[PDB]
């Protein structure tokens, strides 16, 4: 079947999709669907479909968690979050990242701090991920910076960041494992800077039961009926 006939067969399921995405997200998913309609090769169409899969999931992730969807290009790096949130330590950040300058450009799906987006409570987010992981067996990985063996304190508030990595791919374990491995160096770097950060990473795939994703079930039916069917019809034909 011709690419342009697959798009037509799935114009309604992709309109239901684009209708539920954050404004900047749905505009991106819309531009990509057109590229797929005018795709001159099964290669370029796959590459476009891949980007819709991840972008549309990240928007439904922002929705379920009531966070802000920020298009990749507009996403902050690790260096930008410290510069703005820990200026007294950015200079020492740069000094301790001479042999690992790539750390500065690391760009998670969500770079938040507690009241760079702001979040009410970092400990609340970590509890929700740890809860679903324990109740539903969803693979997560979590790392918290911790200078020496320092204790939490009740007499003073510290500024803190929350780094989240999401993903919609078949290999859920490999993603959480490879994500948490990339942040280990920076987590141990923040420890040596006395900066409190928390790294959370998760992933969903299409075999995950519809009630156990990191996005609302409704969003799940929206992705399976559109981006999944596409991939089915994109290979078969």
């Amino acid at each position, epitope marked *: 079947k011709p690419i342009a006939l697959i798009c037509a067969e799935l114009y309604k399921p992709f309109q239901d999709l684009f209708a539920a995405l954050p404004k900047d997200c749905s505009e991106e998913c819309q531009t990509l669907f057109e590229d797929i309609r005018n795709s001159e090769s099964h290669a370029s169409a796959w590459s476009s479909a891949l980007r819709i899969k991840g972008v549309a999931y990240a928007g439904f992730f922002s929705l379920t968690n009531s966070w802000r969807y920020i298009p990749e290009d507009l996403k902050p790096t690790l260096g930008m979050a410290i510069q703005t949130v820990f200026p007294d330590k950015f200079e020492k950040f740069l000094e301790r990242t001479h042999l690992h300058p790539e750390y500065r450009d690391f760009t998670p799906d969500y770079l938040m701090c507690r009241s760079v987006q702001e979040v009410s409570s970092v*400990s609340a987010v970590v*509890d929700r991920f740890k809860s679903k992981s324990s109740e539903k067996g969803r693979p997560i990985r979590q790392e918290e910076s911790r*200078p*020496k*063996t*320092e*204790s*939490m*304190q*009740e*007499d*003073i508030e*510290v500024d803190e960041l929350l780094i989240v990595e999401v993903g919609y791919q078949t290999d859920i374990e490999g993603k959480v494992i490879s994500d948490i491995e990339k942040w280990k160096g920076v987590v141990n770097l923040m420890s040596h800077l*006395g*900066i409190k950060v928390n790294v959370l990473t998760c992933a969903d795939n299409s075999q995950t039961p519809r009630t156990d994703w990191w996005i609302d079930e409704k969003y799940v039916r929206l992705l399976l009926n559109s981006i999944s069917y596409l991939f089915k019809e994109l290979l078969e034909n």
Partner: antibody, heavy 118, light 113 residues
């Protein structure tokens, strides 16, 4: 007046278990981390466990890890210590304490004596 | 673990005189949030401990001003400006900068006679 009242001490055979409780009064107990400290007879103080106000963070001394559980019921203004697989070296006076605004031991109970012995 | 070393073990002191107790830390007690969680307690014989000083030099409410503390990093001192008969007992420093929270072994204040 801030007061902490421990209960639950007594005689316990080695290998046995005991649950200690601490009733808190005179402050909003739910807003503060709570601690257990112990003192073997004729010895110094030895910290046992900490629990944050919302129970999200819990700390243990290595000597009790895997045997003791700290917990709290904030609506009931009560702190607990579940002790299991007790050894004679656990024989101590057990105090609950709190900082009422920090991780130092500002307020102490009168303590309750736990004797582990056959 | 952070080891707190108290000196002297025992401090005979005449009524009215000053007393000083030292507490040395095996690692800095400066927390990454800027505070230093080194505290001083008194345990009179047969009673539960009482806080005297928290975070190095802050006198706890109700504590007589003859008690004071000073220091930073790894070295800390508790001063009793003018010893009273009631000041009899064991003095402990303790730190809550690092888990596990730890105590020194205690200094036994002894009244000279």
């Amino acid at each position: 007046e801030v007061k902490l009242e421990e209960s639950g001490g007594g005689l316990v055979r080695p290998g046995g278990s005991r649950k200690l409780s601490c009733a808190a009064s005179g402050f909003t107990f739910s807003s503060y981390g709570m601690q257990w400290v112990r003192q073997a007879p004729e010895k110094g103080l030895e910290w046992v466990a900490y629990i944050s106000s919302g129970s999200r963070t819990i700390y243990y001394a290595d000597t009790v890890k895997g045997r003791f559980t700290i917990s709290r019921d904030n609506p009931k203004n009560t702190l607990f210590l579940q002790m299991t697989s007790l050894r004679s070296e656990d024989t101590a006076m057990y105090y609950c304490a709190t900082g009422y605004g920090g991780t130092w031991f500002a307020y102490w109970g009168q303590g309750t004596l736990v004797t582990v012995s056959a | 673990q952070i080891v707190l070393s108290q000196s002297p073990l025992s401090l005979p002191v005449s009524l009215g005189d000053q007393a000083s107790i030292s507490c040395r830390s095996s690692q800095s007690l400066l927390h990454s949030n800027g505070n230093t969680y080194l505290h001083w307690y008194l345990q009179k014989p047969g009673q539960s401990p009482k806080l005297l000083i928290y975070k190095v030099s802050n006198r706890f409410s109700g504590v007589p001003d003859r008690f004071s503390g000073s220091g930073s990093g790894t070295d800390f001192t508790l001063k009793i400006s003018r010893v009273e008969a009631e000041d009899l007992g064991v003095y402990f420093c303790s730190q809550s900068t690092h888990v596990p929270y730890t105590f020194g072994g205690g200094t036994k204040l002894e009244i000279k006679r």
